[PDB]
Design an enzyme around this catalytic site. Structure first.
Site, PDB file in Angstrom:
ATOM      1  N   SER A   1     -23.047  17.676  68.705  1.00 25.14           N
ATOM      2  CA  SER A   1     -24.080  16.730  69.121  1.00 25.14           C
ATOM      3  C   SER A   1     -25.279  17.397  69.784  1.00 25.14           C
ATOM      4  O   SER A   1     -26.332  16.752  69.921  1.00 25.14           O
ATOM      5  CB  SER A   1     -23.489  15.687  70.067  1.00 25.14           C
ATOM      6  OG  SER A   1     -22.872  14.633  69.341  1.00 25.14           O
TER       7      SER A   1
ATOM      8  N   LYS B   1     -28.694  17.003  68.289  1.00 23.37           N
ATOM      9  CA  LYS B   1     -29.604  15.887  68.517  1.00 23.37           C
ATOM     10  C   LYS B   1     -30.854  16.310  69.274  1.00 23.37           C
ATOM     11  O   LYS B   1     -31.868  15.602  69.224  1.00 23.37           O
ATOM     12  CB  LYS B   1     -28.872  14.763  69.258  1.00 23.37           C
ATOM     13  CG  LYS B   1     -27.785  14.099  68.396  1.00 23.37           C
ATOM     14  CD  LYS B   1     -26.902  13.164  69.185  1.00 23.37           C
ATOM     15  CE  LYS B   1     -25.890  12.499  68.243  1.00 23.37           C
ATOM     16  NZ  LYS B   1     -24.659  12.036  68.933  1.00 23.37           N
TER      17      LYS B   1
ATOM     18  N   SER C   1     -25.366   9.503  73.002  1.00 22.69           N
ATOM     19  CA  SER C   1     -25.006  10.356  71.861  1.00 22.69           C
ATOM     20  C   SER C   1     -24.452   9.515  70.707  1.00 22.69           C
ATOM     21  O   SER C   1     -23.381   9.789  70.162  1.00 22.69           O
ATOM     22  CB  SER C   1     -24.009  11.444  72.276  1.00 22.69           C
ATOM     23  OG  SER C   1     -24.119  12.607  71.459  1.00 22.69           O
TER      24      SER C   1
ATOM     25  N   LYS D   1     -28.270  17.534  77.481  1.00 25.06           N
ATOM     26  CA  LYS D   1     -27.491  16.975  76.372  1.00 25.06           C
ATOM     27  C   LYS D   1     -26.039  17.453  76.300  1.00 25.06           C
ATOM     28  O   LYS D   1     -25.771  18.660  76.339  1.00 25.06           O
ATOM     29  CB  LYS D   1     -28.159  17.310  75.042  1.00 25.06           C
ATOM     30  CG  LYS D   1     -27.508  16.641  73.856  1.00 25.06           C
ATOM     31  CD  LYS D   1     -27.802  15.134  73.878  1.00 25.06           C
ATOM     32  CE  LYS D   1     -26.922  14.385  72.905  1.00 25.06           C
ATOM     33  NZ  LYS D   1     -25.515  14.206  73.371  1.00 25.06           N
TER      34      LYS D   1
HETATM   35  C1  LIG Z   1     -21.530  14.901  69.482  1.00 25.57           C
HETATM   36  O1  LIG Z   1     -20.959  15.906  69.791  1.00 25.57           O
HETATM   37  C2  LIG Z   1     -20.729  13.579  69.298  1.00 25.57           C
HETATM   38  N1  LIG Z   1     -19.333  13.970  69.035  1.00 25.57           N
HETATM   39  C3  LIG Z   1     -18.528  13.205  68.111  1.00 25.57           C
HETATM   40  O2  LIG Z   1     -18.977  12.241  67.583  1.00 25.57           O
HETATM   41  C4  LIG Z   1     -17.099  13.656  67.816  1.00 25.57           C
HETATM   42  N2  LIG Z   1     -16.939  13.721  66.370  1.00 25.57           N
HETATM   43  C5  LIG Z   1     -16.037  12.706  68.349  1.00 25.57           C
HETATM   44  C6  LIG Z   1     -15.547  12.749  69.641  1.00 25.57           C
HETATM   45  C7  LIG Z   1     -14.563  11.850  70.022  1.00 25.57           C
HETATM   46  C8  LIG Z   1     -14.076  10.929  69.107  1.00 25.57           C
HETATM   47  C9  LIG Z   1     -14.566  10.899  67.811  1.00 25.57           C
HETATM   48  C10 LIG Z   1     -15.549  11.796  67.426  1.00 25.57           C
HETATM   49  C11 LIG Z   1     -20.970  12.695  70.483  1.00 25.57           C
HETATM   50  N3  LIG Z   1     -21.264  13.650  71.743  1.00 25.57           N
HETATM   51  C12 LIG Z   1     -20.022  13.650  72.514  1.00 25.57           C
HETATM   52  C13 LIG Z   1     -20.376  14.026  73.833  1.00 25.57           C
HETATM   53  O3  LIG Z   1     -21.578  13.895  74.207  1.00 25.57           O
HETATM   54  O4  LIG Z   1     -19.530  14.529  74.626  1.00 25.57           O
HETATM   55  C14 LIG Z   1     -19.440  12.074  72.340  1.00 25.57           C
HETATM   56  C15 LIG Z   1     -17.938  12.068  72.616  1.00 25.57           C
HETATM   57  C16 LIG Z   1     -20.154  11.143  73.315  1.00 25.57           C
HETATM   58  S1  LIG Z   1     -19.708  11.673  70.964  1.00 25.57           S
END
Ligand SMILES: *C(=O)[C@@H](NC(=O)[C@H](N)c1ccccc1)[C@@H]1N[C@@H](C(=O)O)C(C)(C)S1
Length: 244
Positions: free
Chosen positions: A35, A38, A92, A196
Site C-alpha cells: 500500500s 498509494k 488505505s 502512509k
Molecule cells: C496496503 O498495504 C493494503 N493492504 C491490503 O489490502 C492487504 N492485501 C490485506 C491486509 C489484510 C487483509 C486483507 C488484505 C491496505 N494497507 C494496510 C495498512 O495500511 O496497514 C491495510 C490493512 C489498511 S489495508
C-alpha cells in the site's frame, strides 16, 4: 552508530535538508511495499489537478476489486475525486486507489507510475504494479528504503498539501463520512504529520513517517515489522534518532 533493535527487516531515517541517512538497515534491499504504492498514486493525482487534467469535484464510481474497500464499508459507489484521494491516504482503501489510477490513465497507469518513478530519481530496483499496491498477475510492487525516501521527499516538496491530509487522524467528507487514519502515531510524536502505512503477509507491517521540528524535517521508512504496533515502535526509535 548504535543499533536500534528494530522489528523491521529494512528501515531508515533521513534528513530532508541534505537527503543524508541518519540510520540505515538493509537500505539497498529490494522489499515488497504494497500500500506504500498509494503515495505514487497520490503524487500523480496531485500532478493531474495542477496540470488542469483532474477536478477535485468530479464524481467517479468505485472500481470493483477481485481487501479493505470503501464500497464494502459504506455501500456507496459514487465519490468525488477529493474523497477518493482522502480515502486512499487515510484508510488505505484499495478500490479508491484503483479508481483514481483508472481515471488517470486506464490500464496504462502502472506504466505511468514507473515513468514517474524514474523521473523522480528512484532506482530501477523500484517497480510499481498497481495504483493500490495490490499484486497484479502475481507480480508485486517492490522498492528500497532509499527509493522510498526519494519518492516521499519529492512528494512533500512538490505537493506540501499532501500533509494537510496525512496529518489528520480523521478526515470528514463534505457529506459527513468519517475516514479514520491508519497512522496511529498522529498526536503521539510531536511534529509528525505523515505519511502512509502498508501491510501484506509478504511485505509485513510497513510505515513511512515524516515529522518536522524547527525547520528540520525527517522521513522514516519501516519495512517488514512483525506486528501492526511494531512498525510504529520502530518509527518512534527512528524519529528519536532523526531529531538527536
Ligand atoms: C496496503 O498495504 C493494503 N493492504 C491490503 O489490502 C492487504 N492485501 C490485506 C491486509 C489484510 C487483509 C486483507 C488484505 C491496505 N494497507 C494496510 C495498512 O495500511 O496497514 C491495510 C490493512 C489498511 S489495508
Amino acid at each position: 552508530q548504535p543499533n536500534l533493535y528494530l522489528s523491521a527487516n529494512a528501515a531508515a531515517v533521513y534528513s530532508v535538508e541534505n537527503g543524508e541517512a541518519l540510520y540505515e538497515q538493509n537500505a539497498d534491499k529490494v522489499m515488497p511495499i504494497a500500500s506504500l504504492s498509494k503515495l505514487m498514486t497520490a503524487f500523480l493525482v496531485l500532478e493531474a489537478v495542477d496540470n488542469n487534467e483532474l477536478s477535485w469535484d468530479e464524481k467517479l464510481d468505485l472500481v470493483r476489486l477481485d481487501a479493505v474497500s470503501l464500497y464494502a464499508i459504506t455501500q456507496k459507489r459514487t465519490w468525488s475525486v477529493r474523497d477518493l484521494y482522502s480515502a486512499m491516504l487515510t484508510m488505505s482503501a484499495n478500490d479508491a486507489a484503483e479508481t483514481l489510477g483508472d481515471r488517470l490513465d486506464g490500464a496504462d497507469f502502472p506504466k505511468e507510475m514507473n515513468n514517474q518513478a524514474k523521473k523522480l530519481g528512484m532506482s530501477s530496483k523500484t517497480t510499481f504494479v498497481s495504483a493500490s499496491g495490490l499484486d497484479v498477475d502475481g507480480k508485486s510492487a517492490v522498492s528500497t528504503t532509499k527509493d522510498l525516501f526519494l519518492l516521499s521527499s519529492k512528494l512533500i516538496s512538490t505537493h506540501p498539501e499532501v500533509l494537510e491530509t496525512t496529518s489528520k487522524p480523521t478526515v470528514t467528507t463534505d457529506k459527513g463520512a468519517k475516514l479514520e487514519s491508519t497512522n496511529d502515531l498522529l498526536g503521539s510524536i510531536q511534529g509528525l504529520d505523515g505519511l502512509k502505512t502498508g501491510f501484506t503477509d509478504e511485505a509485513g507491517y510497513c510505515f513511512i513517517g515524516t515529522a518536522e521540528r524547527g525547520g528540520k524535517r525527517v522521513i522514516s521508512i519501516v519495512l517488514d515489522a512483525g506486528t501492526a504496533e511494531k512498525r510504529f515502535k520502530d518509527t518512534e526509535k527512528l524519529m528519536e534518532v532523526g531529531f538527536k
